[PDB]
Design a protein around this ligand. Sequence first.
Ligand SMILES: CC(=O)SCCNC(=O)CCNC(=O)[C@H](O)C(C)(C)COP(=O)(O)OP(=O)(O)OC[C@H]1O[C@@H](n2cnc3c(N)ncnc32)[C@H](O)[C@@H]1OP(=O)(O)O
Ligand SMILES: CC(=O)SCCNC(=O)CCNC(=O)[C@H](O)C(C)(C)COP(=O)(O)OP(=O)(O)OC[C@H]1O[C@@H](n2cnc3c(N)ncnc32)[C@H](O)[C@@H]1OP(=O)(O)O
Ligand SMILES: Nc1ccnc(=O)[nH]1
Ligand SMILES: Nc1ccnc(=O)[nH]1
Ligand SMILES: [Mg+2]
Ligand SMILES: [Mg+2]
Lengths: 266, 266
Amino acid sequence: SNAMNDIVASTQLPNTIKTITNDLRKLGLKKGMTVIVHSSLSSIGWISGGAVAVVEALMEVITEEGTIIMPTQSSDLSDPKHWSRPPVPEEWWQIIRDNVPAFEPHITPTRAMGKVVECFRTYPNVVRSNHPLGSFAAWGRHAEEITVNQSLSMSLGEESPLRKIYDLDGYILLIGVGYDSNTSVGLSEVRSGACELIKVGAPIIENGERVWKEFVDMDYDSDKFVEIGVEFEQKGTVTMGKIGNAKCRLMKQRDIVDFGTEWFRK
Amino acid sequence: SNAMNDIVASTQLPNTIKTITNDLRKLGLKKGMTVIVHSSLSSIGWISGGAVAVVEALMEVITEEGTIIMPTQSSDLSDPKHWSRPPVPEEWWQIIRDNVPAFEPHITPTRAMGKVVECFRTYPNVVRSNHPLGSFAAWGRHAEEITVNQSLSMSLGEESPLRKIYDLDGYILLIGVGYDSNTSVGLSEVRSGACELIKVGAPIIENGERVWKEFVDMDYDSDKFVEIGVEFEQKGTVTMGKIGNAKCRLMKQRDIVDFGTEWFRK
Ligand SMILES: CC(=O)SCCNC(=O)CCNC(=O)[C@H](O)C(C)(C)COP(=O)(O)OP(=O)(O)OC[C@H]1O[C@@H](n2cnc3c(N)ncnc32)[C@H](O)[C@@H]1OP(=O)(O)O
Ligand SMILES: CC(=O)SCCNC(=O)CCNC(=O)[C@H](O)C(C)(C)COP(=O)(O)OP(=O)(O)OC[C@H]1O[C@@H](n2cnc3c(N)ncnc32)[C@H](O)[C@@H]1OP(=O)(O)O
Ligand SMILES: Nc1ccnc(=O)[nH]1
Ligand SMILES: Nc1ccnc(=O)[nH]1
Ligand SMILES: [Mg+2]
Ligand SMILES: [Mg+2]
């Protein structure tokens, strides 16, 4: 059967803005929170209005007094020398570096972020940071503050939206995804020096002109995060519940980020 | 297939804005022309920049002095009574009608229009017509003239963007797609007077408020569009050429609409 037929079959009644709003409150999402969100649309079961419903639901709970952030990574703009998903012929690499269109926050699609993110990032009043590989989008009270001045180097480091979320004592919401999607733990890797440094590259508009721009980042390794997540959960203070069929987690970003930092040093 | 490794192996060298631009000019696309575009991204072969490269290429060739149109249909808003892809239990139908978010031109995503349209839809200075099921988006000189005052009933009829393209002696561009994707033939169906009406439903904003609205339209049938296409290419004028691996067709909209109108009449 098609993906969609299975999704419908595993749903007893439709998910709606209203039932999603209800499930989010039940889990503990509150007006005025700062929350970074990671999601799988399909994991919820069938939704009337798909991604738009999920976005509107989150907004209705958090409100404009709170802030929603999602990662909007665009790794298709990276140096093809290092591509594996899929690799392309070596003879294409320079053509790509010379022709791939420059990052533009209002235009460039995301890769591997999900339909909720694609909806969110083009939604009215949502704002996006200027990083060409590792940007975030945000909506609400601290949206501009969170996304402004993202350093080109160390995209998940002390000068990124993650650090701004940390200073706001924000929350992480995982909807139907595990710890390997939990971007905030990249901040633990930065602070522990857990992973090696790499020269990266991306196309940007600089002084009006298109430049292939190089910089330093960390070779972030998500495979760790599942391990870290299981140990973090034993310590307590991860709230768990369902949004439709989606296994969801809600936690404080400071808590997991501080635990992650110790996990890598010990 | 649609697997990325297969799309890379289908391609000798990458497609770029520059190569796509050149292919479009070779086919007959010109500065200042009015053109409605239908596309498959995968059909072209691997593109550096994907959908962004295709939109930039089109805009480069046509320029602000021309007009680009694309269908931005949103059939996930239709009455679930008739869904087949997939169908949903009858018990969900009234809940769907009570809960599916209303059409909002800056928010409502498209369904089955393709990645090129989803990219295009969100560009700056792109304007979208007002129809919850059969909207269009446009950019350039005639973008407002074409998209304004679309009627709710007979969505592809005499008060639709299709008739405005017809009046402007515009062109239809198919990229790696067939005549079942040729929306303009709907205007033929309306005009023939030969086809049968149906009651349809969708959620709109009326009085600044969400309502499920019912209206009349044609039971547009794209299998007759395909029959019309085969005959038209035997009889009428159509330019064929390639964009990467994509077989493409460029034709005058007035020519196929007039032919189809006769075809439906017999
Ligand atoms: C550690 C790091 O920094 S990594 C970067 C962080 N990453 C993230 O935050 C991403 C988290 N999300 C994930 O990891 C997810 O597993 C994803 C997005 C990669 C894939 O999950 P999916 O549920 O398959 O995809 P997505 O969430 O885009 O939903 C699309 C699917 O929903 C389904 N769907 C479509 N409409 C509906 C609907 N109305 N209701 C329910 N499901 C629907 C379809 O099957 C669709 O699949 P298709 O695009 O193949 O047609
Ligand atoms: C009756 C009426 O009026 S119909 C309304 C009018 N309809 C239309 O205009 C629709 C016309 N288009 C079609 O019919 C097409 O056949 C479609 C859109 C239905 C499907 O075409 P596809 O090429 O499969 O999809 P689309 O154009 O969205 O491109 C996405 C695909 O491009 C491919 N792709 C992704 N990145 C790249 C890249 N850089 N380079 C090349 N291809 C890529 C992937 O295979 C992707 O598939 P996935 O999402 O399954 O991974
Ligand atoms: N093709 C790819 C694009 C981006 N990253 C990869 O690993 N592969
Ligand atoms: N789920 C569906 C949406 C729109 N049309 C269909 O046939 N099916
Ligand atoms: Mg531009
Ligand atoms: Mg817009």
